[PDB]
Amino acid sequence: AVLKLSEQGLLDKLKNKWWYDKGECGAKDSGSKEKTSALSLSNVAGVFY
Amino acid sequence: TNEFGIFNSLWFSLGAFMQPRSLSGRI
Amino acid sequence: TNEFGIFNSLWFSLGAFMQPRSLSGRI
Amino acid sequence: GLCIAASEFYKTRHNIILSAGIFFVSAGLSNIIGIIVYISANAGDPSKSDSKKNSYSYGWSFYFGALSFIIAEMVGVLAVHMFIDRHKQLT
Numbered sequence: 001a002v003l004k005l006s007e008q009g010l011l012d013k014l015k016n017k018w019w020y021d022k023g024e025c026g027a028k029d030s031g032s033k034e035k036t037s038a039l040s041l042s043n044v045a046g047v048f049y
Numbered sequence: 050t051n052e053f054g055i056f057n058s059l060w061f062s063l064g065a066f067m068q069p070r071s072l073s074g075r076i
Numbered sequence: 077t078n079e080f081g082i083f084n085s086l087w088f089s090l091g092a093f094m095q096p097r098s099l100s101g102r103i
Numbered sequence: 104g105l106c107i108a109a110s111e112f113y114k115t116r117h118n119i120i121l122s123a124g125i126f127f128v129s130a131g132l133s134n135i136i137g138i139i140v141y142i143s144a145n146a147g148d149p150s151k152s153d154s155k156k157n158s159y160s161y162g163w164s165f166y167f168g169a170l171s172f173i174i175a176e177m178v179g180v181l182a183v184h185m186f187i188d189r190h191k192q193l194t
Contacts, residue, residue, distance in 0.1 A: 036152065045143050070087040077188020085184060 104182050107189070117193060120186025127179020134172035138165055 005011050104123035106112035113119050142165055150158065162169065 040147065041143050042147055045139070048139075070083075070090050072086045072090070075086075075090045076093055077191040078185065079188075080191050081184025081187045084187070085180070 104185075107186065117186050117189040120182060120189055124179055124183025124186050127175060127182050129179075131172055131176030131179050134168065134175055138162075138168040138172055141165075 002011075104120060104127070107115065107117065107119035107123055115122075142162065145159075145161065146155075
């Protein structure tokens with residue numbers, strides 16, 4: 001039964017269901033949705049000293 | 050006096066075409 | 077002497093408003 | 104600077120005013136750095152995307168230090184000019 005499930009890709013499917021699908025963090029989606037800008041006096045400060 | 054204003058207007062136009070301590074025009 | 081410092085402070089403010097070999101102020 | 108503004112002093116003619124002037128400037132410079140250094144540090148504090156308005160309030164004292172320091176600097180500058188004039192007169 002285990003061998004049958006794996007060959008039918010049912011095992012891989014189940015893992016994807018509970019690991020990635022049932023996820024709150026789309027990795028390639030969290031990097032595609034991380035917009036912003038702003039500045040940083042930090043770098044400019046080094047030139048002041 | 051009229052030409053003196055033309056020569057100057059051409060000089061300020063050269064100071065315009067971009068690149069003493071008269072504070073007024075200095076700032 | 078007090079005014080001489082004002083005329084100079086206005087000249088250094090013109091050297092401030094951005095654009096001889098006195099090494100000190102040179103660097 | 105007090106001794107250099109005529110007296111009763113100094114007995115360090117001018118020279119003193121130049122020294123006093125630099126000290127005020129340095130004092131102001133130190134103040135500017137301390138305020139800025141302290142200031143730079145708080146702003147960075149990433150926390151972390153929907154703050155800074157928002158987030159905290161900041162200075163505050165900074166403002167005063169931002170003004171006080173500036174004032175000090177100005178004073179120093181004034182002192183320096185005074186000394187310069189004094190020097191000029193002597194010459």
